[PDB]
Amino acid sequence: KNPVPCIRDMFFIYKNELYNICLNDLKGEEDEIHIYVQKKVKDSWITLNDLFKETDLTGRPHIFTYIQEDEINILLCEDEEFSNRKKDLTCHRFYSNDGKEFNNAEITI
């Protein structure tokens, strides 16, 4: 795993482990939008998944984390403009029970 430089934010704790959402978004002709999930192992951050590749979105999404039923939940919702705001919003939920693998379940708002 060789992830591209990104910023670390949205830190949370699960199963007594520190996790992180790494946002890669430098603008260029060789840089895509990568939304990473990393875990603090010893003294290094280990990238687990690239969450944005598992979506059909074209712009930066709105991200949300919440722990529920011993499970992690990361939401990727389409960013809608304030003037051009649609009556229906789309999100992409990513659950997990172990903290290693994730599944997808696209939802609507």
Epitope: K53, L57, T58, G59, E81, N84, T90
Partner: antibody, heavy 126, light 103 residues
Framework: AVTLDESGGGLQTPGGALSLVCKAS????????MGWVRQAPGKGLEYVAG????????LYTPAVKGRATISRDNGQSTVRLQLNNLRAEDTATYFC???????????????????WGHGTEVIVSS | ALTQPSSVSANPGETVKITCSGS???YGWYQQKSPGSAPVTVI????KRPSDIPSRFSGSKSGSTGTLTITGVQAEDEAVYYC?????????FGAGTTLTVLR
Amino acid sequence: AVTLDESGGGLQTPGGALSLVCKASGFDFSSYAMGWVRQAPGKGLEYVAGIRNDGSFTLYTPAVKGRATISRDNGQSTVRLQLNNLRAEDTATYFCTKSADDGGHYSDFSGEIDAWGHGTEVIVSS
Amino acid sequence: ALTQPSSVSANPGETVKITCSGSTYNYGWYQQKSPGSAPVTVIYYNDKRPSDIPSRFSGSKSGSTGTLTITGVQAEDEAVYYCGNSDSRNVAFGAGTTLTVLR
């Protein structure tokens, strides 16, 4: 009465540049994404470039990297395409397409096409 | 990539089924009679049909496979049909499927 009126193609010198346009009518132009589709002689369909409903997101086929520029005028309902450094592989018939969504999803540009133009022919030849 | 069969043959009155695999998102179907001629949308957004397309055309999706359906195919339905979708964050089309009416 959705109409898509293309123009701007024809004989083009290799290594030169061209410009296509698409005068759309019959729908709220600002609410949907637009794009161009080409078809080379004896080949299938290929998506060339797409743009969002407002224009903040553009996509291109790998074969036009660094040579294409897609733009739109929501007040004029015109979407254009510009191709520089023309090669013989760009000789094709180009169709202007309208999407059913805004362009927030990749499958909007090729999976939700609800309107096509009548096409225009580009010939890159010396 | 978006995979669809090369050719499909059918007698008139039969139910034809052209499939397209490779994407879990929204499918479209576009009919082209002559090469270089303007294609016409028959099915878009998985199952929507334009108001000028005959009712025998229908669309479907299951998993990562879109399915176009022509119930009781007619002789005038001869054409090549292209499926469009997003193959791994890339706007793409299928290779095209030619419908040859049997005679």
